Amino acid sequence: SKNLGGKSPGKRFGIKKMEGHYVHAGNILATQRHFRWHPGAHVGLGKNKCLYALEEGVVRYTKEVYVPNPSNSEAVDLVTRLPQGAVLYKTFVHVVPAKPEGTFKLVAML
Amino acid sequence: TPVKAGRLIVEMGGRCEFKEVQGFLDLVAHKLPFPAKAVSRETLEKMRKDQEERERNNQNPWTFERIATANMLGIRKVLSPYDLTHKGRYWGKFYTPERV
Amino acid sequence: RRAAPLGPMPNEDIDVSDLERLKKYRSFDRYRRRAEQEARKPHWWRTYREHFGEESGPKDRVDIGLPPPKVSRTQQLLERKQALRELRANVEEERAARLQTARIPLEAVRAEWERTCGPYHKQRLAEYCGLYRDLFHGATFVPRVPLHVAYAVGEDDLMPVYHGNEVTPTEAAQAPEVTYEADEGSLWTLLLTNLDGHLLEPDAEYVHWLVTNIPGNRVTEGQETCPYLPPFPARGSGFHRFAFLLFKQDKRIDFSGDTRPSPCYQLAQRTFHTFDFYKKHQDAMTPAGLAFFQCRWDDSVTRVFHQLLDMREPVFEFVRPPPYHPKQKRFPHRQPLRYLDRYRDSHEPTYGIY
Amino acid sequence: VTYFSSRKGKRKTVKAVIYRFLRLHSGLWLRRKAGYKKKLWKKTAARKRRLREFVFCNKTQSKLLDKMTTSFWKRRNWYADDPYQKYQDRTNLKV
Amino acid sequence: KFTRSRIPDKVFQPSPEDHEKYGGDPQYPHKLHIVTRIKSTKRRPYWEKDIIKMLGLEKAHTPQVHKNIPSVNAKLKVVKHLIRIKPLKLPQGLPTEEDMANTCLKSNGELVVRWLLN
Amino acid sequence: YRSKPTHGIGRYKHLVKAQEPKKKKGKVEVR
Amino acid sequence: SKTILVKMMSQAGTGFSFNTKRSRLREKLTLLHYDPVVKKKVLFVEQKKIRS
RNA sequence: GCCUAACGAGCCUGGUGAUAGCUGGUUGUCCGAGAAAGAAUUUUAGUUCAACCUUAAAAAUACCCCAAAAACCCUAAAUUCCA
RNA sequence: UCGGAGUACAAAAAACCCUCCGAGUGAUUUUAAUCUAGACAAACCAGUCAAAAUAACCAUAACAUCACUUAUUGAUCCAAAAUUUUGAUCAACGGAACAAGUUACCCUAGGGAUAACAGCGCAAUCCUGUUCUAGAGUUCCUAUCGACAAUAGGGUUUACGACCU
RNA sequence: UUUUUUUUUUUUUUUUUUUUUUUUUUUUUUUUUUUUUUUUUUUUUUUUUUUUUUUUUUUUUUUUUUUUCCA
Ligand SMILES: Nc1nc2c(ncn2[C@@H]2O[C@H](COP(=O)(O)O)[C@@H](O)[C@H]2O)c(=O)[nH]1
Ligand SMILES: [Mg+2]
Ligand SMILES: [Mg+2]
Ligand SMILES: [Mg+2]
Ligand SMILES: [Mg+2]
Ligand SMILES: [Mg+2]
Ligand SMILES: [Mg+2]
Ligand SMILES: [Mg+2]
Ligand SMILES: [Mg+2]
Ligand SMILES: [Mg+2]
Ligand SMILES: [Mg+2]
Ligand SMILES: [Mg+2]
Ligand SMILES: [Mg+2]
Ligand SMILES: [Mg+2]
Ligand SMILES: [Mg+2]
Ligand SMILES: [Mg+2]
Ligand SMILES: [Mg+2]
Ligand SMILES: [Mg+2]
Ligand SMILES: [Mg+2]
Ligand SMILES: [Mg+2]
Ligand SMILES: [Mg+2]
Ligand SMILES: [Mg+2]
Ligand SMILES: [Mg+2]
Ligand SMILES: [Mg+2]
Ligand SMILES: [Mg+2]
Ligand SMILES: [Mg+2]
Ligand SMILES: [Mg+2]
Ligand SMILES: [Mg+2]
Ligand SMILES: [Mg+2]
Incomplete structure (x- = not known):
C-alpha cells in the first residue's frame, strides 16, 4: 500500500448546547472548524472559532442577514459581486439573558 | 458503464416500421448481460399503462408499499431502507415488472 | 429528508440563469442599506427581534389628545x-x-x-423613556402645545427643563415657571408626577405640584391642589423621572377627594395613580403638554428628608447577583488548588476541636 | 509495593509518591502538571500558565496513592506557616 | 443501518368504510383503550422492549386499560405490531364504589357492572 | 438543518459565478 | 534556512531573560519587550545563544 | 565424537516450594442480581484505566419525548436537545 | 508520530497492509503579561477556550500575522543552566540509559487462536454443455468450426479462506 | 563546549623561482580630467623547534562554517 498517515482521531467539532438550554457565562456553545454558526448577541468568538456565552440565559438560533466587516476584502468583494436583490443570510446563535443586572437593596436607613 | 433497469441503451429512428427493428435488435438485447427488449414509444406506453392498471386493480388489500410504509408486523427489521422506494419491485440488480 | 418552506424564500425572486444581464450593486453602503431594510421585515422564521423583545410587535396605541x-x-x-x-x-x-x-x-x-415637528419627537422620546407605559399603560398622546419649564437658580441663572434633561434637586428646590401659548378662554391643569421614588408601592407614583383650573397662561392665578415639593430621590437608586403633564379642560372641574392639605408632608396622602386620575377626569381633561426630566440624588435631599418629611434618609445600593458555581465534587479532576477557595464560607481558619 | 517487610514485617511505601505528590487531610492529592519545565519558548502563555498551575487527582489515582503510601503520610500535620493548612480541610461538601 | 421507523400520518387517516367495517362511531371517538400483548419482545428492538415495559404489558394475554390521548397513542403506534387494541365499552356505565367487587370484563370488549347476581 | 423548512437560506454560491482562480487564461471562444 | 535560539536579558538592571527564535544570518537581536519586574516596556538585547 | 545405557556439554546434593503472560485440576445445598470489548502497552496468549455489572448508603429526577432548533453547491433511512 | 478529504450522506465517535494530500517548518513585526469565573474534549497523562480585575501604549485593539492553518511536534528521571532556562529520526514517535546474526546439533511450555498433506466453503482459474450469427468452409452460419457476447451446471489443477484436528 | 579550514603587498588570486591584476607615487599623452604607455615601492598574522625550499608540525588572539543531547 502507498497510503499512510491518514489515521487521525476526530476533533469532536460540533454543537454543544441546543436551543432552549439554560447556560452560564463561559460555557462553550459550539465548536467548529469553519464558520458554520456565527455568534450573535452575548456570544463571544474565540481565536479557534469557538462560541461561548458571555451572559447567563437561554440559547437561541436564528437566521439573520449578514453584513461583513468592511476590512474583509474577500467578503466585501463577494458583497459587491452579489446581484441587486441578493442578501446574505447566516445562522446566528444568541443568548437571551435571564438574570437581571442587579437589584437595589436598602443597606442603611440613616 | 453502470446501467440501471429501465434505461435505454440504443435509440433508433427513421422511416421504417417496428417489426424489422425489433427483429434485428432482439439479438442485441439477448446478447446484452442484463435482460433487455426491443421496444418503441407505443410499446413502452402500453407496458407502463398495463403496469399502472394492474397496480390499481390489484385485488388483495395488502401491498408491499403499504406494508413497508406502515411498518406492519415490524417488517422494517427484515427490509432495507431502499425498499421503501423500490416498493418490492427491485431486489439487488434484478427487477420484476410483474410484482406490482 | 426535505420539508417545504413555510413561506417565500428570501432569494427565490431573482433568476439564477444569466447573471451577467442582471444589475449588481458595487457599493458596500448600498448592500448595507438593502440588508437593514430587509432585516426589519416580519420574516416567518425565528428572528432576532422575536427572541430579544420587539415589544410584542405591532401595538394598536389608543390616542388621547387634541386633533392635529x-x-x-x-x-x-x-x-x-x-x-x-x-x-x-x-x-x-x-x-x-x-x-x-x-x-x-x-x-x-x-x-x-x-x-x-417637535410634538412627534417629544412623543417618541417619551415612548423611549416609558412615560406612557407608567402613566396610562395603553395610550400615548401627541404633545401638541409647547411647554417651557424653567427653574430659577438665582437672579440671572435659569435652568430649562427639556424632554429628558438632568436637573438636580438643588436647582429644583423652588417652584418652576411654566410657559405655554393659550387664549383667555380655556382652562388648564398642571401636574408634576415623580414616577420613581415610592418606597412601598412599585405601581404608584408621587405628586409634587398639582395645580388645577388655570385661566389661560396665568398659572399662578389658578388654585393649587398640591403645594410644590422638592424632589427627594434615593441616594442609591438614582436617576428618577419627574414629568410635568399639562391637560386642557372645558368645564370647571371641582374635586374634594383629590384635594391636598397645605402642609401635605404625608407620603400616604402623596400617593397617586395617573390612570385612576384620568379615569376620574376623562370627560373634560385631555393631555396636551408633556415635559419629563431626570433627577439624581445630591446633598439637598438630606434636608428634605430630615426637616420636611421628618424621616431618616434611606440609602440603597446596586447589589449584584452572587457568582454561579457548580456543585462541589468529592474528587475534582484536573482542577487548580484554588478550587477549594470557591466554596469557602469565610477567610478565617476554623479549628473544630483544637 | 512491599506489603510485608523483611525486617519489621510492616508495610513500606514508595518514595516516588511522597517526592512528587502531596496529600491533604481531606483525602485529596495534589500534583504538578506534567511538562511544566520543558520547552517553554515553544508554548503559549496560557499553556505555560496551565502547566505552572497545580492540579488535583481523581478517585482512582487517589485510591492508588493511598494504597501505595502508609498511614504515616495520612496523619494530620500542623506545620508552622504551612501554606496548605487552609486547604487541609473541606467545607460545604453536600454529598 | 436499522433504526426506528417513521410512520407517515397518512396511515392513521380513517376511511369512511373503516368505521362500518370495525364497528366504530364516525362522530365520537371512544374513551379508553384495552390493550393486549400478543407477540413477544424477543427478537425486537430495545426501544420497543422499553415501550412495552412502560406500558405495563409485561404479562402477555392480559388486558390493560389506557387513555385515548395522543401521548399514549404515540407509543401504541410505535408498538402497534405487538398488541391488539379494542375500545372499552360500558353498557351499564361506570361502576360505582358499591359495585367495584362485582365487576367483570367480557372478552368482547365490554365491562359489565353487575356480575353474578346471587 | 437539512430537515428544517429553513434549509438553504444561506445558499449564495448560485448567486455569483465568478470562481475562476486562474492566472491569466482567456476564453476567446465566442463564435 | 537554519534558525537560532537566543536568550535575551533585560536592560533595566533586573535579572529577566527570555528565549526567542531568530534567523542565523541576521544581526544581533535587539527588541522591545515587557518586563513584569519593573512592569515596563524595556529594551532587550541578545545575550546568549542556547540552541541552534 | 566419547567422558558408565538420554552429552551442542556428565551425574549427585544444595540454592529449590527456581521461575513461568503457558497447559491441566481446584472437593456441600439452595436463593438474588448478573457482563462480548473504547484507550495505552517489546502490546494484542497479558495487564492498567474508561464504559457496563454486584453488595451497601444518600438523594432526585430518570427513559418515550409534541412543537421549535442543529451550513454552507445535491443528498435516503434517520440522529442530538427538550414539554 | 500528527493534521485534511471519503469511507463515516444530517449531534459526536467509529477500523482495515482502505483511496488521495501533506507535516518533523519558513518569512515579517503589532515581541504577543499577571491573575481568575465558567465551559469543550478526554481512561489517565496530556490538549483546548475564556468573562471580569490589574501593568504599558490609542486615552476606541491587542487572538502576533501569512504560507488549504488544521499538523509543524516529546511524559519522568539526568545533565548542563545559574534565579531562570535549554534540551539527540526515544521516528518501534506514551518512550528500557547503553545489547547483532545462525541453529537441519537443538531444547522446553503451549497453539488447529497459526501454516504445509487431507477434508470443507467459493469458483478467480479449470471443464462442460446450450443462446446469438458476423466470418471460415468454391456458392452455403450451424458437414466440421466459429471471434466480440449471454445463460446454466461440475468441483479434477493452481490460487483464496483458516472451520476440524 | 566540541569538530574543521585558516591569518598575503593597501584590495583579491595563486605558489615557494614569493608571482598576476586592482590601489599608491614619479613621468608621458590632453587645454584640463578620464582612458591609455613606462619606472618604483609594496607580504606568508605572531612563538618555537627544522628541512635542500618551505605549502613540517606547535604558543596568543581574530573572524569564522557544522554539531551542541531521545529522555
Ligand atoms: N466477554 C464476555 N464473555 C462472555 C459473556 N457471557 C459469556 N461469556 C463467555 O462465553 C462462554 C460461555 O458461553 P455461554 O455458556 O455463555 O453460552 C465463556 O467463555 C464465557 O466467558 C459476556 O457477557 N461477556
Ligand atoms: Mg480521517
Ligand atoms: Mg482512529
Ligand atoms: Mg405636504
Ligand atoms: Mg548417561
Ligand atoms: Mg510455579
Ligand atoms: Mg502473553
Ligand atoms: Mg437468576
Ligand atoms: Mg452471554
Ligand atoms: Mg421534535
Ligand atoms: Mg426530559
Ligand atoms: Mg464532556
Ligand atoms: Mg478582559
Ligand atoms: Mg513500544
Ligand atoms: Mg507506541
Ligand atoms: Mg495518543
Ligand atoms: Mg548437514
Ligand atoms: Mg516440543
Ligand atoms: Mg482453525
Ligand atoms: Mg480468533
Ligand atoms: Mg494424506
Ligand atoms: Mg488445504
Ligand atoms: Mg478430516
Ligand atoms: Mg475463492
Ligand atoms: Mg458453480
Ligand atoms: Mg465466407
Ligand atoms: Mg442476456
Ligand atoms: Mg476433491
Ligand atoms: Mg495444494
Missing part, C-alpha cells in the same frame, strides 16, 4: 416651494456653500421644530 391642526397641504407646499426658490435665487448663499463658511439660526430652527 388642519393645514392646507397645497398652499403649504406652494409657500415652501416659493421660499426655497427665493433662497436658491441668492448668489451669496451659494458662494458661502462653495467656500464652506455658513451658519444657521439655531434659535429659529428650534422654534420652527417645536412648532411643526
